[PDB]
Amino acid sequence: DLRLHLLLNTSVTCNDGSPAGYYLKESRGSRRWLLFLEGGWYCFNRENCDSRYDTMRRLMSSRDWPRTRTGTGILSSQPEENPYWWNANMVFIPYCSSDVWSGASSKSEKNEYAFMGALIIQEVVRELLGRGLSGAKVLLLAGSSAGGTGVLLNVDRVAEQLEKLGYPAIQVRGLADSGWFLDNKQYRHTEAIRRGIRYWNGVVPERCRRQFQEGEEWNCFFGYKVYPTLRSPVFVVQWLFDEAQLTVDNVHLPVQEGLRLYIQNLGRELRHTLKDVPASFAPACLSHEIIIRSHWTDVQVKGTSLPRALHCWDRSLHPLKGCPVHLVDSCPWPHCNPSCPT
Ligand SMILES: Nc1ccc(S(=O)(=O)Nc2ccccn2)cc1
Ligand SMILES: *[C@@H]1O[C@H](CO)[C@@H](O)[C@H](O)[C@H]1NC(C)=O
């Protein structure tokens, strides 16, 4: 069980102005800290944010949050469930800003909602330093789906935050799960992200912003474009046939030639974008998210599980014989890997 703490700085808020927060389980024999960013789509104007407030309110407000959460997958403290980091300090950061973790805008007489995802992450880091993060050796910022994209947008900001606060010895790294999307042509017929950034006052990493320049910051929400601009080490986990990617592409699974070619090309394109990503795990499965699922230990690429790959990554940041870090399936159809989940 991780225990809830609402932010002491109550001006850093969820969408509706309630305080943001984090769930924490300390492990005082460990200098490793895992901060996990929850996912869950987004909203990009008054009308669809109003709809989200009616039926997804826990993603917009802390007023109904429970006082505890069970840690699962990479957040589990049991070695059998989490071979990688079972003895780490565990933090789960709820997603209540609806902005892919990019926003820096307060509620006001001009704004019905607050979009403060980027500031929530910084305030969580600040308050954790007084609860033991100051003695850390590694801070791993992880996240799934919208939280995986949030890792890409914020990992270098966390690294700069700790440097300027006077903690240059804490090594900041990122783990982005199911947040690596392609801005491809649909099977049947990015503007929402463009509108969202203006609505949220969204922020992107500075080097990426300077490449694409004003009006074009939406480009930095796509992993293959923002990743080359990042300085912190980042491990990328992405199913080659991600279900959220197929949903936005208007694909719903008797497959005929046109759809067969479309699906095969999508996998080839995703594999291509990961060619120069040295720390990555990309199986040929139809699925979405993995790292906080209890059976995340089950899938393998070329005989290597994801917990092993992450361990090999740790060793590489001190090629390794028998301990690979770049694991991308070459077979071209969903479930051509026998270890895919059912
Ligand atoms: N082809 C394509 C894929 C995803 C999207 S998105 O609106 O959901 N934008 C994003 C971007 C990064 C993370 C999550 N959503 C739009 C178009
Ligand atoms: C609380 O957070 C806000 C937003 O980041 C900031 O302006 C303010 O200085 C913070 N308060 C304190 C006491 O640090």
Q: How would you describe the overall organization of this protein?
A:
Strand 6 (138-144), helix 3 and strand 7 (171-177) form a beta-alpha-beta unit. The longest helix is centred in the middle third of the chain and has 20 residues, at 146-165. The protein has helices at residues 46-55, 117-129, 146-165, 191-200, 206-212, 223-226, 243-248, 257-273, 306-316, and strands at 2-6, 21-25, 32-37, 68-69, 89-93, 138-144, 171-177, 234-237, 241-242, 280-282, 286-287, 300-301, 304-305, 326-328. The chain has one domain. By secondary structure, the chain is α/β, with parallel strands linked by helices. It contains nine helices and 14 strands. It is globular. The structure holds 4-amino-N-(pyridin-2-yl)benzenesulfonamide and 2-acetamido-2-deoxy-beta-D-glucopyranose (NAG). 2-acetamido-2-deoxy-beta-D-glucopyranose is lined by residues 9, 11-12, 119. Its EC number is 3.1.1.98. One of its GO terms (cellular component) is endoplasmic reticulum lumen.
